[PDB]
PDB file of all heavy atoms in Angstrom:
ATOM      1  N   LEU A   1       0.814  -1.213   0.000  1.00 48.11           N
ATOM      2  CA  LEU A   1       0.000   0.000   0.000  1.00 48.11           C
ATOM      3  C   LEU A   1       0.849   1.265   0.000  1.00 48.11           C
ATOM      4  O   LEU A   1       0.420   2.295  -0.532  1.00 48.11           O
ATOM      5  CB  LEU A   1      -0.943   0.002   1.205  1.00 48.11           C
ATOM      6  CG  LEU A   1      -2.065  -1.037   1.191  1.00 48.11           C
ATOM      7  N   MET A   2       2.045   1.212   0.579  1.00 45.46           N
ATOM      8  CA  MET A   2       2.848   2.406   0.796  1.00 45.46           C
ATOM      9  C   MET A   2       3.695   2.734  -0.427  1.00 45.46           C
ATOM     10  O   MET A   2       4.258   1.844  -1.070  1.00 45.46           O
ATOM     11  CB  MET A   2       3.754   2.230   2.016  1.00 45.46           C
ATOM     12  CG  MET A   2       3.005   1.935   3.301  1.00 45.46           C
ATOM     13  SD  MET A   2       1.722   3.151   3.658  1.00 45.46           S
ATOM     14  CE  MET A   2       2.700   4.636   3.860  1.00 45.46           C
ATOM     15  N   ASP A   3       3.778   4.023  -0.740  1.00 47.10           N
ATOM     16  CA  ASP A   3       4.725   4.514  -1.735  1.00 47.10           C
ATOM     17  C   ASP A   3       6.071   4.717  -1.049  1.00 47.10           C
ATOM     18  O   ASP A   3       6.230   5.628  -0.232  1.00 47.10           O
ATOM     19  CB  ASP A   3       4.221   5.809  -2.360  1.00 47.10           C
ATOM     20  CG  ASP A   3       2.995   5.603  -3.226  1.00 47.10           C
ATOM     21  OD1 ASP A   3       2.949   4.601  -3.971  1.00 47.10           O
ATOM     22  OD2 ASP A   3       2.077   6.446  -3.161  1.00 47.10           O
ATOM     23  N   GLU A   4       7.039   3.868  -1.375  1.00 51.05           N
ATOM     24  CA  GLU A   4       8.337   3.876  -0.722  1.00 51.05           C
ATOM     25  C   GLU A   4       9.354   4.661  -1.546  1.00 51.05           C
ATOM     26  O   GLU A   4       9.122   5.011  -2.705  1.00 51.05           O
ATOM     27  CB  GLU A   4       8.806   2.440  -0.475  1.00 51.05           C
ATOM     28  CG  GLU A   4       7.857   1.666   0.432  1.00 51.05           C
ATOM     29  CD  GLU A   4       8.209   0.199   0.539  1.00 51.05           C
ATOM     30  OE1 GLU A   4       9.281  -0.111   1.093  1.00 51.05           O
ATOM     31  OE2 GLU A   4       7.419  -0.645   0.065  1.00 51.05           O
ATOM     32  N   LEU A   5      10.495   4.946  -0.922  1.00 48.32           N
ATOM     33  CA  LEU A   5      11.474   5.883  -1.462  1.00 48.32           C
ATOM     34  C   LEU A   5      12.826   5.196  -1.593  1.00 48.32           C
ATOM     35  O   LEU A   5      13.361   4.677  -0.609  1.00 48.32           O
ATOM     36  CB  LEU A   5      11.592   7.124  -0.572  1.00 48.32           C
ATOM     37  CG  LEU A   5      10.416   8.107  -0.499  1.00 48.32           C
ATOM     38  CD1 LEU A   5       9.281   7.584   0.373  1.00 48.32           C
ATOM     39  CD2 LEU A   5      10.890   9.468  -0.005  1.00 48.32           C
ATOM     40  N   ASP A   6      13.377   5.202  -2.807  1.00 48.62           N
ATOM     41  CA  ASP A   6      14.739   4.730  -3.055  1.00 48.62           C
ATOM     42  C   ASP A   6      15.662   5.941  -3.011  1.00 48.62           C
ATOM     43  O   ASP A   6      15.786   6.676  -3.993  1.00 48.62           O
ATOM     44  CB  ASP A   6      14.830   4.010  -4.395  1.00 48.62           C
ATOM     45  CG  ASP A   6      13.878   2.835  -4.493  1.00 48.62           C
ATOM     46  OD1 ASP A   6      13.831   2.025  -3.543  1.00 48.62           O
ATOM     47  OD2 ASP A   6      13.170   2.724  -5.518  1.00 48.62           O
ATOM     48  N   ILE A   7      16.311   6.154  -1.868  1.00 47.37           N
ATOM     49  CA  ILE A   7      17.179   7.310  -1.680  1.00 47.37           C
ATOM     50  C   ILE A   7      18.590   6.837  -1.355  1.00 47.37           C
ATOM     51  O   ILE A   7      18.841   5.633  -1.224  1.00 47.37           O
ATOM     52  CB  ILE A   7      16.633   8.250  -0.587  1.00 47.37           C
ATOM     53  CG1 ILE A   7      16.513   7.512   0.745  1.00 47.37           C
ATOM     54  CG2 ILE A   7      15.278   8.812  -0.994  1.00 47.37           C
ATOM     55  CD1 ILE A   7      15.800   8.316   1.817  1.00 47.37           C
ATOM     56  N   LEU A   8      19.517   7.782  -1.213  1.00 44.74           N
ATOM     57  CA  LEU A   8      20.945   7.495  -1.167  1.00 44.74           C
ATOM     58  C   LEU A   8      21.526   7.871   0.189  1.00 44.74           C
ATOM     59  O   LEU A   8      21.249   8.957   0.709  1.00 44.74           O
ATOM     60  CB  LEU A   8      21.683   8.252  -2.272  1.00 44.74           C
ATOM     61  CG  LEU A   8      23.186   8.001  -2.368  1.00 44.74           C
ATOM     62  CD1 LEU A   8      23.460   6.688  -3.083  1.00 44.74           C
ATOM     63  CD2 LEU A   8      23.878   9.162  -3.061  1.00 44.74           C
ATOM     64  N   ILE A   9      22.343   6.979   0.745  1.00 44.90           N
ATOM     65  CA  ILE A   9      23.079   7.277   1.969  1.00 44.90           C
ATOM     66  C   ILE A   9      24.193   8.262   1.642  1.00 44.90           C
ATOM     67  O   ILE A   9      25.019   8.016   0.756  1.00 44.90           O
ATOM     68  CB  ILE A   9      23.645   5.997   2.597  1.00 44.90           C
ATOM     69  CG1 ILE A   9      22.519   5.102   3.115  1.00 44.90           C
ATOM     70  CG2 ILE A   9      24.623   6.337   3.714  1.00 44.90           C
ATOM     71  CD1 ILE A   9      23.004   3.768   3.642  1.00 44.90           C
ATOM     72  N   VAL A  10      24.218   9.387   2.352  1.00 44.57           N
ATOM     73  CA  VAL A  10      25.273  10.374   2.173  1.00 44.57           C
ATOM     74  C   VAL A  10      26.028  10.675   3.459  1.00 44.57           C
ATOM     75  O   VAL A  10      27.149  11.205   3.387  1.00 44.57           O
ATOM     76  CB  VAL A  10      24.720  11.682   1.569  1.00 44.57           C
ATOM     77  CG1 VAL A  10      24.266  11.458   0.134  1.00 44.57           C
ATOM     78  CG2 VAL A  10      23.583  12.224   2.423  1.00 44.57           C
ATOM     79  N   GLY A  11      25.472  10.363   4.628  1.00 48.45           N
ATOM     80  CA  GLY A  11      26.125  10.675   5.881  1.00 48.45           C
ATOM     81  C   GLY A  11      26.035   9.514   6.850  1.00 48.45           C
ATOM     82  O   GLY A  11      25.188   8.630   6.722  1.00 48.45           O
ATOM     83  N   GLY A  12      26.927   9.535   7.831  1.00 49.77           N
ATOM     84  CA  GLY A  12      26.975   8.490   8.833  1.00 49.77           C
ATOM     85  C   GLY A  12      27.099   9.061  10.229  1.00 49.77           C
ATOM     86  O   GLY A  12      27.613  10.160  10.433  1.00 49.77           O
ATOM     87  N   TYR A  13      26.613   8.288  11.197  1.00 46.48           N
ATOM     88  CA  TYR A  13      26.700   8.639  12.606  1.00 46.48           C
ATOM     89  C   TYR A  13      27.132   7.412  13.393  1.00 46.48           C
ATOM     90  O   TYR A  13      26.711   6.294  13.089  1.00 46.48           O
ATOM     91  CB  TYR A  13      25.361   9.146  13.153  1.00 46.48           C
ATOM     92  CG  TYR A  13      24.774  10.329  12.423  1.00 46.48           C
ATOM     93  CD1 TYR A  13      24.067  10.161  11.239  1.00 46.48           C
ATOM     94  CD2 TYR A  13      24.904  11.616  12.930  1.00 46.48           C
ATOM     95  CE1 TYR A  13      23.519  11.242  10.572  1.00 46.48           C
ATOM     96  CE2 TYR A  13      24.358  12.702  12.271  1.00 46.48           C
ATOM     97  CZ  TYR A  13      23.666  12.509  11.092  1.00 46.48           C
ATOM     98  OH  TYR A  13      23.119  13.582  10.427  1.00 46.48           O
ATOM     99  N   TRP A  14      27.974   7.626  14.400  1.00 47.73           N
ATOM    100  CA  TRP A  14      28.385   6.530  15.266  1.00 47.73           C
ATOM    101  C   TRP A  14      27.252   6.145  16.207  1.00 47.73           C
ATOM    102  O   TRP A  14      26.516   7.003  16.701  1.00 47.73           O
ATOM    103  CB  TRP A  14      29.625   6.917  16.069  1.00 47.73           C
ATOM    104  CG  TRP A  14      30.882   6.954  15.261  1.00 47.73           C
ATOM    105  CD1 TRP A  14      31.556   8.063  14.843  1.00 47.73           C
ATOM    106  CD2 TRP A  14      31.619   5.826  14.770  1.00 47.73           C
ATOM    107  NE1 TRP A  14      32.669   7.697  14.124  1.00 47.73           N
ATOM    108  CE2 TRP A  14      32.732   6.329  14.068  1.00 47.73           C
ATOM    109  CE3 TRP A  14      31.448   4.440  14.860  1.00 47.73           C
ATOM    110  CZ2 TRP A  14      33.666   5.497  13.453  1.00 47.73           C
ATOM    111  CZ3 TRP A  14      32.378   3.616  14.252  1.00 47.73           C
ATOM    112  CH2 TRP A  14      33.473   4.148  13.556  1.00 47.73           C
ATOM    113  N   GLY A  15      27.116   4.844  16.461  1.00 46.10           N
ATOM    114  CA  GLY A  15      26.060   4.343  17.314  1.00 46.10           C
ATOM    115  C   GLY A  15      26.420   4.377  18.787  1.00 46.10           C
ATOM    116  O   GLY A  15      27.507   4.786  19.191  1.00 46.10           O
ATOM    117  N   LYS A  16      25.469   3.934  19.608  1.00 47.70           N
ATOM    118  CA  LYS A  16      25.674   3.865  21.048  1.00 47.70           C
ATOM    119  C   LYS A  16      24.982   2.626  21.596  1.00 47.70           C
ATOM    120  O   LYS A  16      24.152   2.001  20.930  1.00 47.70           O
ATOM    121  CB  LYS A  16      25.164   5.130  21.754  1.00 47.70           C
ATOM    122  CG  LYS A  16      23.664   5.165  22.011  1.00 47.70           C
ATOM    123  CD  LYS A  16      23.283   6.409  22.804  1.00 47.70           C
ATOM    124  CE  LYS A  16      21.820   6.388  23.211  1.00 47.70           C
ATOM    125  N   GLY A  17      25.341   2.272  22.826  1.00 47.71           N
ATOM    126  CA  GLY A  17      24.729   1.118  23.465  1.00 47.71           C
ATOM    127  C   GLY A  17      25.103  -0.165  22.750  1.00 47.71           C
ATOM    128  O   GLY A  17      26.271  -0.404  22.424  1.00 47.71           O
ATOM    129  N   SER A  18      24.095  -1.007  22.503  1.00 44.51           N
ATOM    130  CA  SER A  18      24.318  -2.271  21.809  1.00 44.51           C
ATOM    131  C   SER A  18      24.854  -2.071  20.398  1.00 44.51           C
ATOM    132  O   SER A  18      25.503  -2.973  19.858  1.00 44.51           O
ATOM    133  CB  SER A  18      23.018  -3.074  21.763  1.00 44.51           C
ATOM    134  OG  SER A  18      21.945  -2.284  21.276  1.00 44.51           O
ATOM    135  N   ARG A  19      24.597  -0.913  19.790  1.00 43.84           N
ATOM    136  CA  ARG A  19      25.104  -0.591  18.463  1.00 43.84           C
ATOM    137  C   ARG A  19      26.324   0.321  18.517  1.00 43.84           C
ATOM    138  O   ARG A  19      26.613   1.024  17.541  1.00 43.84           O
ATOM    139  CB  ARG A  19      23.994   0.032  17.616  1.00 43.84           C
ATOM    140  CG  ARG A  19      22.955  -0.990  17.175  1.00 43.84           C
ATOM    141  CD  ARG A  19      21.583  -0.380  16.959  1.00 43.84           C
ATOM    142  NE  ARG A  19      21.447   0.253  15.652  1.00 43.84           N
ATOM    143  CZ  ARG A  19      20.295   0.701  15.163  1.00 43.84           C
ATOM    144  NH1 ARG A  19      19.182   0.582  15.876  1.00 43.84           N
ATOM    145  NH2 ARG A  19      20.254   1.266  13.962  1.00 43.84           N
ATOM    146  N   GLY A  20      27.047   0.320  19.632  1.00 41.25           N
ATOM    147  CA  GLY A  20      28.265   1.097  19.711  1.00 41.25           C
ATOM    148  C   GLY A  20      29.371   0.499  18.863  1.00 41.25           C
ATOM    149  O   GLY A  20      29.451  -0.713  18.662  1.00 41.25           O
ATOM    150  N   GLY A  21      30.229   1.376  18.346  1.00 41.16           N
ATOM    151  CA  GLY A  21      31.374   0.965  17.566  1.00 41.16           C
ATOM    152  C   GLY A  21      31.150   0.870  16.073  1.00 41.16           C
ATOM    153  O   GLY A  21      32.096   0.539  15.344  1.00 41.16           O
ATOM    154  N   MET A  22      29.942   1.148  15.590  1.00 41.22           N
ATOM    155  CA  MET A  22      29.646   1.048  14.169  1.00 41.22           C
ATOM    156  C   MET A  22      28.724   2.182  13.746  1.00 41.22           C
ATOM    157  O   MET A  22      28.040   2.798  14.565  1.00 41.22           O
ATOM    158  CB  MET A  22      29.016  -0.309  13.823  1.00 41.22           C
ATOM    159  CG  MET A  22      27.830  -0.695  14.692  1.00 41.22           C
ATOM    160  SD  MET A  22      27.212  -2.342  14.294  1.00 41.22           S
ATOM    161  CE  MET A  22      25.841  -2.487  15.436  1.00 41.22           C
ATOM    162  N   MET A  23      28.727   2.458  12.443  1.00 41.51           N
ATOM    163  CA  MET A  23      27.805   3.421  11.846  1.00 41.51           C
ATOM    164  C   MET A  23      26.409   2.816  11.867  1.00 41.51           C
ATOM    165  O   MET A  23      26.070   1.975  11.031  1.00 41.51           O
ATOM    166  CB  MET A  23      28.238   3.766  10.425  1.00 41.51           C
ATOM    167  CG  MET A  23      29.562   4.505  10.345  1.00 41.51           C
ATOM    168  SD  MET A  23      29.460   6.146  11.080  1.00 41.51           S
ATOM    169  CE  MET A  23      31.191   6.600  11.111  1.00 41.51           C
ATOM    170  N   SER A  24      25.589   3.242  12.829  1.00 39.96           N
ATOM    171  CA  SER A  24      24.290   2.621  13.054  1.00 39.96           C
ATOM    172  C   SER A  24      23.127   3.384  12.435  1.00 39.96           C
ATOM    173  O   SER A  24      22.072   2.784  12.210  1.00 39.96           O
ATOM    174  CB  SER A  24      24.034   2.458  14.557  1.00 39.96           C
ATOM    175  OG  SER A  24      23.804   3.713  15.171  1.00 39.96           O
ATOM    176  N   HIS A  25      23.278   4.683  12.176  1.00 39.28           N
ATOM    177  CA  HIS A  25      22.242   5.461  11.511  1.00 39.28           C
ATOM    178  C   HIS A  25      22.900   6.405  10.515  1.00 39.28           C
ATOM    179  O   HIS A  25      24.106   6.659  10.572  1.00 39.28           O
ATOM    180  CB  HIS A  25      21.350   6.233  12.500  1.00 39.28           C
ATOM    181  CG  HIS A  25      22.095   6.927  13.598  1.00 39.28           C
ATOM    182  ND1 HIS A  25      22.932   6.264  14.470  1.00 39.28           N
ATOM    183  CD2 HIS A  25      22.090   8.223  13.995  1.00 39.28           C
ATOM    184  CE1 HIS A  25      23.430   7.124  15.341  1.00 39.28           C
ATOM    185  NE2 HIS A  25      22.932   8.319  15.077  1.00 39.28           N
ATOM    186  N   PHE A  26      22.092   6.918   9.589  1.00 36.61           N
ATOM    187  CA  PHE A  26      22.623   7.550   8.392  1.00 36.61           C
ATOM    188  C   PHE A  26      21.799   8.767   8.000  1.00 36.61           C
ATOM    189  O   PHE A  26      20.613   8.870   8.323  1.00 36.61           O
ATOM    190  CB  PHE A  26      22.655   6.566   7.215  1.00 36.61           C
ATOM    191  CG  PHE A  26      23.314   5.263   7.540  1.00 36.61           C
ATOM    192  CD1 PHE A  26      22.557   4.156   7.884  1.00 36.61           C
ATOM    193  CD2 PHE A  26      24.693   5.146   7.513  1.00 36.61           C
ATOM    194  CE1 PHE A  26      23.165   2.952   8.190  1.00 36.61           C
ATOM    195  CE2 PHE A  26      25.307   3.946   7.816  1.00 36.61           C
ATOM    196  CZ  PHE A  26      24.541   2.847   8.156  1.00 36.61           C
ATOM    197  N   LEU A  27      22.453   9.681   7.290  1.00 36.09           N
ATOM    198  CA  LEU A  27      21.804  10.810   6.639  1.00 36.09           C
ATOM    199  C   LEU A  27      21.568  10.455   5.176  1.00 36.09           C
ATOM    200  O   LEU A  27      22.465   9.932   4.507  1.00 36.09           O
ATOM    201  CB  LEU A  27      22.666  12.068   6.757  1.00 36.09           C
ATOM    202  CG  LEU A  27      22.209  13.345   6.052  1.00 36.09           C
ATOM    203  CD1 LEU A  27      20.814  13.741   6.495  1.00 36.09           C
ATOM    204  CD2 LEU A  27      23.192  14.466   6.327  1.00 36.09           C
ATOM    205  N   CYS A  28      20.361  10.724   4.685  1.00 36.85           N
ATOM    206  CA  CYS A  28      19.958  10.313   3.350  1.00 36.85           C
ATOM    207  C   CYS A  28      19.546  11.525   2.526  1.00 36.85           C
ATOM    208  O   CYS A  28      19.074  12.531   3.064  1.00 36.85           O
ATOM    209  CB  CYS A  28      18.809   9.305   3.409  1.00 36.85           C
ATOM    210  SG  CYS A  28      19.214   7.787   4.296  1.00 36.85           S
ATOM    211  N   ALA A  29      19.719  11.416   1.208  1.00 38.29           N
ATOM    212  CA  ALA A  29      19.514  12.541   0.308  1.00 38.29           C
ATOM    213  C   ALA A  29      18.883  12.063  -0.994  1.00 38.29           C
ATOM    214  O   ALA A  29      18.864  10.869  -1.303  1.00 38.29           O
ATOM    215  CB  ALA A  29      20.834  13.268   0.019  1.00 38.29           C
ATOM    216  N   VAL A  30      18.362  13.024  -1.758  1.00 32.93           N
ATOM    217  CA  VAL A  30      17.829  12.782  -3.092  1.00 32.93           C
ATOM    218  C   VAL A  30      18.638  13.604  -4.089  1.00 32.93           C
ATOM    219  O   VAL A  30      19.325  14.564  -3.732  1.00 32.93           O
ATOM    220  CB  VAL A  30      16.327  13.116  -3.201  1.00 32.93           C
ATOM    221  CG1 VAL A  30      15.514  12.181  -2.326  1.00 32.93           C
ATOM    222  CG2 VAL A  30      16.074  14.565  -2.813  1.00 32.93           C
ATOM    223  N   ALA A  31      18.539  13.219  -5.356  1.00 32.69           N
ATOM    224  CA  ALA A  31      19.403  13.752  -6.398  1.00 32.69           C
ATOM    225  C   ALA A  31      18.730  14.880  -7.173  1.00 32.69           C
ATOM    226  O   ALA A  31      17.502  15.003  -7.206  1.00 32.69           O
ATOM    227  CB  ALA A  31      19.817  12.644  -7.369  1.00 32.69           C
ATOM    228  N   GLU A  32      19.563  15.711  -7.794  1.00 33.78           N
ATOM    229  CA  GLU A  32      19.090  16.639  -8.810  1.00 33.78           C
ATOM    230  C   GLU A  32      19.059  15.935 -10.159  1.00 33.78           C
ATOM    231  O   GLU A  32      19.985  15.198 -10.511  1.00 33.78           O
ATOM    232  CB  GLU A  32      19.993  17.872  -8.881  1.00 33.78           C
ATOM    233  CG  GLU A  32      19.860  18.827  -7.705  1.00 33.78           C
ATOM    234  CD  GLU A  32      20.619  20.125  -7.924  1.00 33.78           C
ATOM    235  OE1 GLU A  32      21.697  20.087  -8.554  1.00 33.78           O
ATOM    236  OE2 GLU A  32      20.134  21.185  -7.476  1.00 33.78           O
ATOM    237  N   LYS A  33      17.989  16.161 -10.912  1.00 31.45           N
ATOM    238  CA  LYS A  33      17.811  15.505 -12.200  1.00 31.45           C
ATOM    239  C   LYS A  33      18.937  15.894 -13.156  1.00 31.45           C
ATOM    240  O   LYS A  33      19.137  17.092 -13.408  1.00 31.45           O
ATOM    241  CB  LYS A  33      16.457  15.879 -12.800  1.00 31.45           C
ATOM    242  N   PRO A  34      19.693  14.937 -13.687  1.00 32.34           N
ATOM    243  CA  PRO A  34      20.779  15.272 -14.610  1.00 32.34           C
ATOM    244  C   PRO A  34      20.329  15.153 -16.055  1.00 32.34           C
ATOM    245  O   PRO A  34      19.332  14.476 -16.351  1.00 32.34           O
ATOM    246  CB  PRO A  34      21.848  14.225 -14.271  1.00 32.34           C
ATOM    247  CG  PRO A  34      21.046  13.023 -13.879  1.00 32.34           C
ATOM    248  CD  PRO A  34      19.748  13.526 -13.269  1.00 32.34           C
ATOM    249  N   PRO A  35      21.038  15.796 -16.982  1.00 32.08           N
ATOM    250  CA  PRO A  35      20.686  15.697 -18.408  1.00 32.08           C
ATOM    251  C   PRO A  35      20.768  14.263 -18.900  1.00 32.08           C
ATOM    252  O   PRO A  35      21.394  13.412 -18.249  1.00 32.08           O
ATOM    253  CB  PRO A  35      21.740  16.584 -19.088  1.00 32.08           C
ATOM    254  CG  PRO A  35      22.138  17.559 -18.031  1.00 32.08           C
ATOM    255  CD  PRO A  35      22.105  16.784 -16.746  1.00 32.08           C
ATOM    256  N   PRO A  36      20.146  13.955 -20.041  1.00 34.31           N
ATOM    257  CA  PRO A  36      20.103  12.563 -20.515  1.00 34.31           C
ATOM    258  C   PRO A  36      21.489  11.948 -20.654  1.00 34.31           C
ATOM    259  O   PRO A  36      22.429  12.582 -21.139  1.00 34.31           O
ATOM    260  CB  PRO A  36      19.405  12.678 -21.875  1.00 34.31           C
ATOM    261  CG  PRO A  36      18.575  13.892 -21.762  1.00 34.31           C
ATOM    262  CD  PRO A  36      19.343  14.848 -20.894  1.00 34.31           C
ATOM    263  N   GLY A  37      21.603  10.690 -20.228  1.00 30.78           N
ATOM    264  CA  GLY A  37      22.863   9.981 -20.234  1.00 30.78           C
ATOM    265  C   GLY A  37      23.812  10.348 -19.116  1.00 30.78           C
ATOM    266  O   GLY A  37      24.744   9.582 -18.839  1.00 30.78           O
ATOM    267  N   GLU A  38      23.610  11.487 -18.461  1.00 31.18           N
ATOM    268  CA  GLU A  38      24.480  11.930 -17.384  1.00 31.18           C
ATOM    269  C   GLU A  38      23.958  11.440 -16.039  1.00 31.18           C
ATOM    270  O   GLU A  38      22.765  11.174 -15.869  1.00 31.18           O
ATOM    271  CB  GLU A  38      24.596  13.455 -17.376  1.00 31.18           C
ATOM    272  N   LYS A  39      24.887  11.317 -15.072  1.00 29.48           N
ATOM    273  CA  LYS A  39      24.589  10.904 -13.712  1.00 29.48           C
ATOM    274  C   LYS A  39      24.503  12.117 -12.794  1.00 29.48           C
ATOM    275  O   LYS A  39      25.175  13.128 -13.024  1.00 29.48           O
ATOM    276  CB  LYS A  39      25.661   9.938 -13.198  1.00 29.48           C
ATOM    277  CG  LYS A  39      25.784   8.672 -14.036  1.00 29.48           C
ATOM    278  CD  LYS A  39      27.014   7.856 -13.663  1.00 29.48           C
ATOM    279  CE  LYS A  39      27.141   6.614 -14.538  1.00 29.48           C
ATOM    280  N   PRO A  40      23.672  12.047 -11.753  1.00 27.25           N
ATOM    281  CA  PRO A  40      23.512  13.201 -10.862  1.00 27.25           C
ATOM    282  C   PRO A  40      24.807  13.529 -10.136  1.00 27.25           C
ATOM    283  O   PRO A  40      25.638  12.656  -9.872  1.00 27.25           O
ATOM    284  CB  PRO A  40      22.419  12.751  -9.885  1.00 27.25           C
ATOM    285  CG  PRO A  40      22.423  11.263  -9.957  1.00 27.25           C
ATOM    286  CD  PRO A  40      22.828  10.909 -11.353  1.00 27.25           C
ATOM    287  N   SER A  41      24.975  14.813  -9.818  1.00 26.83           N
ATOM    288  CA  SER A  41      26.187  15.291  -9.161  1.00 26.83           C
ATOM    289  C   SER A  41      25.941  16.052  -7.867  1.00 26.83           C
ATOM    290  O   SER A  41      26.880  16.191  -7.074  1.00 26.83           O
ATOM    291  CB  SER A  41      26.998  16.187 -10.112  1.00 26.83           C
ATOM    292  OG  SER A  41      26.189  17.205 -10.681  1.00 26.83           O
ATOM    293  N   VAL A  42      24.731  16.545  -7.624  1.00 25.46           N
ATOM    294  CA  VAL A  42      24.392  17.268  -6.404  1.00 25.46           C
ATOM    295  C   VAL A  42      23.228  16.557  -5.733  1.00 25.46           C
ATOM    296  O   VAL A  42      22.292  16.112  -6.406  1.00 25.46           O
ATOM    297  CB  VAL A  42      24.044  18.742  -6.697  1.00 25.46           C
ATOM    298  CG1 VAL A  42      23.480  19.422  -5.458  1.00 25.46           C
ATOM    299  CG2 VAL A  42      25.272  19.481  -7.201  1.00 25.46           C
ATOM    300  N   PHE A  43      23.291  16.445  -4.405  1.00 27.00           N
ATOM    301  CA  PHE A  43      22.271  15.764  -3.621  1.00 27.00           C
ATOM    302  C   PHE A  43      21.795  16.657  -2.482  1.00 27.00           C
ATOM    303  O   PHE A  43      22.580  17.390  -1.874  1.00 27.00           O
ATOM    304  CB  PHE A  43      22.798  14.429  -3.070  1.00 27.00           C
ATOM    305  CG  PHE A  43      23.022  13.388  -4.130  1.00 27.00           C
ATOM    306  CD1 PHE A  43      24.138  13.440  -4.949  1.00 27.00           C
ATOM    307  CD2 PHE A  43      22.109  12.363  -4.318  1.00 27.00           C
ATOM    308  CE1 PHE A  43      24.342  12.489  -5.932  1.00 27.00           C
ATOM    309  CE2 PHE A  43      22.310  11.406  -5.299  1.00 27.00           C
ATOM    310  CZ  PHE A  43      23.428  11.471  -6.107  1.00 27.00           C
TER     311      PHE A  43
END
């Protein structure tokens, strides 16, 4: 039922507690539409 989102990991945060010592959560971004055949460069 849900419209889900395919987005990109751009940032990381260190975890705490049971998830200490690893990147446990992340900052996510979407792209700017690039011209045909080209790949996005700004998020």
